[PDB]
Nucleic acid binder design. Sequence first.
DNA 1: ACCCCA
Length: 76
Amino acid sequence: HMLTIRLLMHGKEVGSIIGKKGESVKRIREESGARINISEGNSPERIITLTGPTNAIFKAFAMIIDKLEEDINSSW
DNA sequence: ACCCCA
């Protein structure tokens, strides 16, 4: 029933997930219940690790993709 | 674009 899932993301996408002052990722952690770790520093690729029961992981993933979708094509 | 918490 508990898993660890790792997402490989570009830095621009991590900016969208984390949000201003971390307000987005703090919301995703609190609402999903997943433990969510994001690798540090402005590297071209970043790793997001989701841990928890599979329903916590699924909700965190849904939130993350919904945030990326809202922010698609938003910076150039 | 957003940079969290460890």
